[PDB]
Amino acid sequence: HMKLSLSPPPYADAPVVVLISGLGGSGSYWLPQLAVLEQEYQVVCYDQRGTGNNPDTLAEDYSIAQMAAELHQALVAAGIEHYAVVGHALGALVGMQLALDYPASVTVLISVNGWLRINAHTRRCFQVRERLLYSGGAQAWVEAQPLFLYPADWMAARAPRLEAEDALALAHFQGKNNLLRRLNALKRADFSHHADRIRCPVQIICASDDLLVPTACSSELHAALPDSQKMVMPYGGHACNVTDPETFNALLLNGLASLLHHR
Template sequence: MHLEIQGLQTADAPTLVLSSGLGGVAGFWRPQLAALEQHYRVVTYDQRGTGRSADTLPEGYSMAMMAAELAEALEQQGIERFDLIGHALGGLIGLQLALDYPQRVGRVVVINGWLSLNAHTRRCFQVRQDLLLNVGVEAFVRAQPLFLYPAEWMARNQARLEQEDTHHVQHFQGMENLLRRLHALKSADFRPHAAKITQPVLAIYSQDDLLVPWSCSPELAAALPNASLIEMAWGGHAMSVTDAENFNALLLQWLTRKEAKDEYA
C-alpha cells in the first residue's frame, strides 16, 4: 500500500490519517495538506487496488478488509495511535477502524457519510455502475463530477475538470476493483454497531450534496454516543475541494476543541 507521511515528525506528534472516498487516491486531500501539516503528522495513502497501490481485489471484499489493510500499513510504519479524517467511503473506513481497533483510534471525522446506505445514494451508485458496464470507463469518469461538485463550481472549472477526466481515465482502478469496492461500500451498515463507537466523531456535511442527502449526517450523529455535527451550506459532495478554506477552518476548530493530550499517551 502506497503511504506517505508529511507534516510534524516528532515522536509525540498527533497523527491524522486521511482516507479518500471511492476514488481511493491520496491526491484528493491536496487542498487540506498545508493547513494540517502545521499541526499534525499527516498520513495519506492510496487505497488497495487504486492509484499507486495496484492490486487485484478479492471477491467478497469488505469494509472490514479495507480497515484491516490500513491498520496493518500504519503498524508497519510504527503508527499505533491515530485520528482519521475520511470522505464518504473513507469516513466509513474510519468508523470500521473505531469498531475493530478501538485502542488505536482516537477521533474520527466523517465527511458526507452515512449510518446505512440511503435509497437516493443507492440510485446514484446504480446510475454510475450502469454507465461503467454499459457505456464504458470514459462515460463513467465524465459523469463523476456531476455527483461531486456544484454546477456553478463546475462551470467555472471546465479546464480543470477536463484535465482530471483525462488523468482519471488513464489511471482508472479497473472495472473489477471498482465494482468490488462499490459493493463493499453499499453493503456497509453501522446501525447494529453504532453504540459501540465511543470515540469522538465529527459528522460534517454539505447541504447541497447531490450524492448523499444532507439528512444522512444528522442520522449518523444521532446514533453515535459521542458525535458532533457541522453543516456547510455549499460545496457539494466534495466540499473539502470546492470550499477548502472554509472546510479547513471548521475542521481545525473541531480538532482543536477535541484535542486531548492523554489520548496519545
C-alpha cells in the same frame, strides 16, 4: 503491504491524522487540506488497495473490514499506533470500521459526507453510475463522476481544471473489477447497530448540497453516535473539502482540536 504517504511532523510527536478518501481511493484527493493539516499534525495519505499506487486485483469477498485491516496494519507497520481518522464518504465508513475494530488506536474520527448505511438515494445514484460503467466504460464513468461531487457553478467556472481532472481520472481509473468490488463493499457496510460501540469523539461534516449522499445521512449518524458534533456547510457538494476548502479547513482544524481535547 500497502504504500502510505507520511508527511513530515511539524514538531516532535505531533498527533497523527490519517486521511481516507472515498471511492476514487486517491490520497491526492486531500491536497487542499494537506498544507493546513501538516502545520499541526503528522499527516498520513494513501491510495486504497486496487487504486493508484497500490494496484491489486480485489477479491470477490472484499469488505470494509478488510479495507480497515489493510490500512491499520500498514499504519502499525509504519510505527503508528494511535491516530485520528478523517474520512470522506467511503473513507468515513473505513474510519468507523477502524473505530470499531481498533478502539485502542483511533483517537478521534471525522466523517465527511458519510453515512450509517447506504440510503436509497445513494443507491439510485450508484445504479445510474453503474449503468454508465457497463454501457460506456471508464470514459462514461469519469464523465458523470464530477456531477455527483461538485456544484454546477463551481465546475462550470473551472473548465480547464475539470478537463485536466477528467483526463487524470481516465488514465488512473482503478478498473471495473476493483471499482465493482469496492462499490459492493461500500453498499454492504452497515453501522446502524454498531454506532453505540464507536465511543471516540466524532465530528460529522456535511454539505447541504451534496447530490450523492443526502445530509439526512449525517443527521442519522449524529443521532446514532454517543459522542458526536455535526457541522453543515451550506454549499460545496459531496467534494466540499475540494470546492470550498476555506470553510472546510476551518471546520476541520477546529474540529480536530476540539475532538482531541474532549478526549
